[PDB]
């Protein structure tokens, strides 16, 4: 029953075309609930959930102020890291930031995150002890020194450890009927012939929440994990997810392969077979 | 809520 509230920030520099583009997204569990785009004319933290619109105008006044201050901060780190790597000032560069907390089913703190990234690769991160950083390269050692001399990991401690836990346990009761639901998968199986002597078996899983599911193709006990397409858990778009696993079993050998589904919304794993 | 206005800058 562990729950998490994560915030994803994507600051992309566009030299010669205006200010860097900034996008901020927040997710309780896998349900987005806020949004911020530096191009949208609103220039405000826009709700994206029905259970988050019950927050007074002061919530959206503080939230907008605290996300634009991160937008302007990332607007000066892009120029700072550009010189740190000594790159040309006419190229596009991306700074990504993620943080949040993990709150158990008890409603208590489990783990706090803070992870930055420059150009897709890891840049710096916050260790599980919440007081030490893990620089990823030789340019991030300067940041790790600026963030230790100014106690960046100690001021941030009262947010991941205290503020995220208190504010995430506000969403899990406001969004009680949405975030705290487990919809079981609507599993089914299909046979698509490709040849007279070869065929494929597709094991489906539609409309399950949360997105964490496992589809496996065991052939008489042994789980294959070989020649088994396992496309990523894809969102249906209505707050649920979809996923399917395939296999290239030969014709006439259909009735020896089984599909097992282990979703937390299911009483026990399923044992889908053909027919 | 997003992190406040405390920090330094990379």
């Amino acid at each position: 029953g562990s729950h998490s509230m994560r915030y994803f920030f994507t600051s992309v520099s566009r030299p010669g075309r205006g200010e860097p583009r900034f996008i901020a997204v927040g997710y309780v569990d896998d349900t987005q609930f806020v949004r911020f785009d530096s191009d949208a004319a609103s220039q405000r933290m826009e709700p994206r959930a029905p259970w988050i619109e019950q927050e007074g105008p002061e919530y959206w006044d503080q939230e907008t102020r605290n996300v634009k201050a991160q937008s302007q901060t990332d607007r000066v780190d892009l120029g700072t890291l550009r010189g740190y790597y000594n790159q040309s000032e006419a190229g596009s560069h991306t700074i990504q930031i993620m943080y949040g907390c993990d709150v158990g089913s008890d409603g208590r703190f489990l783990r706090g995150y803070r992870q930055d990234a420059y150009d897709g690769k890891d840049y710096i991160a916050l260790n599980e002890d919440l007081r030490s950083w893990t620089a990823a390269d030789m340019a991030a050692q300067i940041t790790k020194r600026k963030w230790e001399a100014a106690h960046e990991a100690e001021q941030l401690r009262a947010y991941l450890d205290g503020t995220c836990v208190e504010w995430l346990r506000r969403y899990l009761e406001n969004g009680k009927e949405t975030l705290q639901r487990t919809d079981p998968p609507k599993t089914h199986m299909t046979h698509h012939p490709i040849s007279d002597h070869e065929a494929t078996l597709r094991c489906w899983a539609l409309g399950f929440y949360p997105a964490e599911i496992t589809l496996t193709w065991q052939r008489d006990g042994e789980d294959q994990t070989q020649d088994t397409e396992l496309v990523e858990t894809r969102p249906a778009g209505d707050g649920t997810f979809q996923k399917w696993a395939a296999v290239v079993v030969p014709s006439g050998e259909e009735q020896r392969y089984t599909c097992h589904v282990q979703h937390e919304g299911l009483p026990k794993p399923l044992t889908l077979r053909w027919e | 809520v997003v992190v406040g206005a405390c920090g330094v800058g990379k």
């Epitope: 703190f109 450890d161 205290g162 208190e166 504010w167 | -």
Partner: antibody
Framework: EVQLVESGGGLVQPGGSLRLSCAAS????????IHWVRQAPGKGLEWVAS????????SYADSVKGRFTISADTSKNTAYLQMNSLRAEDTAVYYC???????????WGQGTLVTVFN | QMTQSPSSLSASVGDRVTITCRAS??????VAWYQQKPGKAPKLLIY???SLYSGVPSRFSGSRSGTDFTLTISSLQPEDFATYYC???????????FGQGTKVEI
């Protein structure tokens, strides 16, 4: 090393005005909160109001919610507490504290008696 | 709401005393313990409900059994007779709440 010195409280009539000043010294004032806590005579501690020197966030105790206003001058290391519409129950010893990054007021002042007298 | 129990407890030197604090809707992060000797500014002892503040003697220690926070003095000394307050902060409401206070006597 950190010293919090509070001053400016004394005898005042109900429905009057006071401005309690907490002169912090010993730390970067912009990085720590400054809380005002009052100790009613004989009774226990009661948190009154709060300020965040950077980002300018305030808070009040719902018993001094509309009456008190905290300000803070960053280049004076001095946080103020303006007390309006002072009631007979507002008399106490007012300590100014320091939110110390740990969700705890690690450094406290000394106290400033405020006597609302009719 | 939050009730600190008991409002007074008397024990001799060397005993083990436990002051409980019922922080129903509080995070473990924001629960701290203070010690106010009469007519003096309080003194932080525990923060985050278990972590000793630097300089505090190691006989103080906190814990949490469910929605209930405890301060334990392992071996009482003739300097630990004061009034003890537990705080709780609600980041949602932006309020620090101080417990009633437990007066440890002789």
């Amino acid at each position: 090393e950190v010293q919090l010195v509070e001053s400016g409280g004394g005898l005042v009539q109900p429905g009057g005005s006071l401005r309690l000043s907490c002169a912090a010294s010993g730390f970067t004032f912009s990085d720590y909160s400054i809380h005002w806590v009052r100790q009613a005579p004989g009774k226990g501690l009661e948190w009154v109001a709060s300020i965040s020197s950077s980002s300018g966030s305030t808070s009040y105790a719902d018993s001094v919610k509309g009456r008190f206003t905290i300000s803070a001058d960053t280049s004076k290391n001095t946080a103020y507490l303006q007390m309006n519409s002072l009631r007979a129950e507002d008399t106490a010893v007012y300590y100014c504290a320091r939110g110390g990054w740990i969700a705890a007021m690690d450094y406290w002042g000394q106290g400033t008696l405020v006597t609302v007298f009719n | 709401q939050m009730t600190q129990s008991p409002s007074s407890l008397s024990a001799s030197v060397g005993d083990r005393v436990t002051i409980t604090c019922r922080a129903s809707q509080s995070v473990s992060s924001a629960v701290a313990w203070y010690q106010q000797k009469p007519g003096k500014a309080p003194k932080l002892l525990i923060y985050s409900a278990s972590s000793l503040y630097s300089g505090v003697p190691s006989r103080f220690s906190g814990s949490r059994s469910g929605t209930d926070f405890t301060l334990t003095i392992s071996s009482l000394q003739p300097e630990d007779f004061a009034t003890y307050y537990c705080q709780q902060a609600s980041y949602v409401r932006k309020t620090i709440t101080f417990g009633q206070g437990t007066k440890v006597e002789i």
